[PDB]
Amino acid sequence: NRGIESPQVLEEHGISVYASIPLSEWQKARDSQLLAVGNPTDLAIEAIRSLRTSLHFAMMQAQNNVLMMTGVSPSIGMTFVCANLAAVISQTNKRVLLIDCDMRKGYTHELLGTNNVNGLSEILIGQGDITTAAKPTSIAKFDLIPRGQVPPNPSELLMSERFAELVNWASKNYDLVLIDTPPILAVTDAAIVGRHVGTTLMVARYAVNTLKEVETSLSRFEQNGIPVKGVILNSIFRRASAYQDYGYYEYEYKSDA
């Protein structure tokens, strides 16, 4: 039980790997901005496009257009996968709303070219109407409700009836609703949010998160009655390149002119 080296490791333990997102060297370079826009040919984006296809089917089964993105631990890319997925879904001619439920460390507004004025934090206490809430981002058909000002009681705010009101509104007013949450192993927040969502997906970093960590995470959700559809393996990289193997294998399918 070390850092997950293969999607098969968790697949064999009855944990379905919904997507295996490679490490984008373009993003890695820029970090030292939205990739779906910056470099749309990227294998990470092509993997997120696969995730969108898997989701469409998985959400027709759930019949609820709300989806939660949670992670195992902090800084594994759950905000990266979430923002880029919403971006890719909007490109399918669908009105997408992203709710940044990370009222502790959320920075969607910054990443999506939006102000943090009258965000989720404000909406939840009362100050700020639910209908007005949504803010347009640098991407067409993609709107965002940022975290708002950092509250002293994030978990307690999500516990309110005002949160269920907002999610219900969002569900009615948008084609798809994505909720970015803080990691389950750090704070309870995601479990609280999970009560209102129809589909839950969990991010795990490639050679970093352990099978025990993943199992513990999924346990916390079950314990609170939240079904998790599957796991997303982010920041995967090639090791033993053979004829593309080690469980990963990804092909450069470059279009013609």
* Site residues for ligand ADP per CB under 6 A: 21, 23-24, 27-28, 31, 44, 71, 74-80, 234-235
Closest CA to 72 of 222, 238, 201: 201
Supply angle C-alpha 191, 171, 89, rounded to 5. 90
202 φ/ψ angles, rounded to the nearest 5 degrees: -120, 130
* Residue pair 144/114 in contact by the 8 Å Cβ criterion: yes
Could you give the dihedral angle defined by the CA atoms of residues 186, 73, 56 and 131, in that order, rounded to the nearest 10 degrees? Answer: 40
The answer to whether residue 65 forms part of the interface with Ca ion (CB under 5 A) is no
The answer to whether residue 2 forms part of the interface with a second copy (CB under 8 A) is yes
The answer to whether residue 79 forms part of the interface with Ca ion (CB under 5 A) is yes
Binding partner selected for residue 40 from ligand ADP, Ca ion, a second copy, none, CB under the kind-specific 5 to 8 Å limit: a second copy
The answer to whether residue 169 forms part of the interface with a second copy (CB under 8 A) is no
Binding partner selected for residue 32 from a second copy, ligand ADP, Ca ion, none, CB under the kind-specific 5 to 8 Å limit: none
Query: Angle formed by the axes of helices 78-90 and 43-62, to 10°?
Result: 80
* Residues in CB range of 53: below 8 A, 6 or more apart: none
Q: Which is nearer to ligand ADP, 217 or 235 (CB)?
A: 235
The answer to whether residue 40 forms part of the interface with a second copy (CB under 8 A) is yes
Binding partner selected for residue 28 from Ca ion, a second copy, ligand ADP, none, CB under the kind-specific 5 to 8 Å limit: ligand ADP
Fill in the per-residue mask, 88 to 117: x = in contact with Ca ion (CB under 5 A), - = not in contact. --------------x---------------
* Residue pair 39/76 in contact by the 8 Å Cβ criterion: no
**If binding means CB under 8 A, how many residues of this protein chain bind a second copy?**
75
The answer to whether residue 225 forms part of the interface with a second copy (CB under 8 A) is yes
Specify the 3-state DSSP secondary structure of 198.
Answer: coil
* Residues in CB range of 110: below 8 A, 6 or more apart: none
| Closest separation in Å from C-beta 60 to Ca ion | 26
Q: Which residue in 5, 23, 26, 50 binds a second copy (CB under 8 A)?
A: 50
In the region spanning residues 120 to 149, those forming contacts with a second copy, defined by CB under 8 A, are 149
